Design a protein around this ligand. Structure first.
Ligand code: GDP
Length: 140
RNA sequence: GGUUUAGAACGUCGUGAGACAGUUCGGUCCCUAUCUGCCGUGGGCGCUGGAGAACUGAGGGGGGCUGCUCCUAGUACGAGA
C-alpha cells in the first residue's frame, strides 16, 4: 500500500522576511536530498523553485510551491523521511500565500537573518503563526 | 559645389537694350623659396697641449584617453522594489 508509515512525514514550512534566503535554503535542501544537482542560485534565476518567469527575472519568490524529498535523521542520509517543504514568499503583498500555507502545515522552519535579526515581515508571519499555533523552529 | 563674368531659359518687371537676396543648365584657380619660421642633416671654430673614448646632467620635447564584464556584492541603502 502506502510507501511509508506516517511517522516518516514531516510537513514543514519555510517562511521569513523578504530575501532572508528561503528559496536558497530550499534549493540547498533539494540538492542535499538529491532531487537537484547543481545547487544553483536565484539572482541568476536558474533555480527550479522559480518558474513563472517573473521570479526568474525579478529574483523574488512570489508564490508558494510545495516540494518533497527524502532526507533522513536516523543514521542520516539513510532511513529516508518525507520532508514536504513549502517555499512560501515573505512579501507583505503576498502574505496571503503565507496565510493559507501556514494554515495548512503541521510545522514550519522560520528563517531569520544574522544581520538584522527579526524584520517587520518576520514579526508579521509571527502573528500568522501564532494565529494557528503552528509549531516552528528558527533557522538563522 | 555656391557666390557674383561672358552662352541659355523660365517667372516677373521694362514698350527696350536689359534687370531681380528668384530659380535652372555650363563655365581656365598661376608662382623653380632670397630672408624669417619649422622639420632634419651637416661643414668651421671654439671649448687654452693634441688625441680616443665613456659619461653626469642644466635645459627642452614626447606620453598622460578611456568603456564593458567579473570579483568584492545582492553587500551598505531600503518594508520592498
Ligand atoms: N551572503 C549570503 N547571501 C545569501 C544567502 N542566502 C541568500 N542570499 C542572497 O540573497 C539574494 C536572494 O536570495 P533569495 O533566495 O532570493 O532569498 P529569499 O528571497 O528569501 O528566497 C541572492 O543574491 C543571494 O546571493 C546567505 O546565506 N548568505
Amino acid at each position: 500500500a502506502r510507501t511509508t508509515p506516517i511517522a516518516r512525514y514531516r510537513n514543514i514550512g519555510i517562511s521569513a522576511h523578504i530575501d532572508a534566503g528561503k528559496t536558497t535554503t530550499t534549493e540547498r535542501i533539494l540538492f542535499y536530498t538529491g532531487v537537484n544537482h547543481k545547487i544553483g542560485e536565484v539572482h541568476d534565476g536558474a533555480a527550479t523553485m522559480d518558474w513563472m518567469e517573473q521570479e526568474q527575472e525579478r529574483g523574488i519568490t512570489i508564490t508558494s510551491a510545495a516540494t518533497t524529498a527524502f532526507w533522513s535523521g536516523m543514521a542520516k542520509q539513510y532511513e529516508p523521511h518525507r520532508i514536504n517543504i513549502i517555499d512560501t514568499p515573505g512579501h507583505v503583498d503576498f502574505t496571503i500565500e503565507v496565510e493559507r500555507s501556514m494554515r495548512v502545515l503541521d510545522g514550519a522552519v522560520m528563517v531569520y537573518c544574522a544581520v538584522g535579526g527579526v524584520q517587520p515581515q518576520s514579526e508579521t508571519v509571527w502573528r500568522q503563526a501564532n494565529k494557528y499555533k503552528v509549531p516552528r523552529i528558527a533557522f538563522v
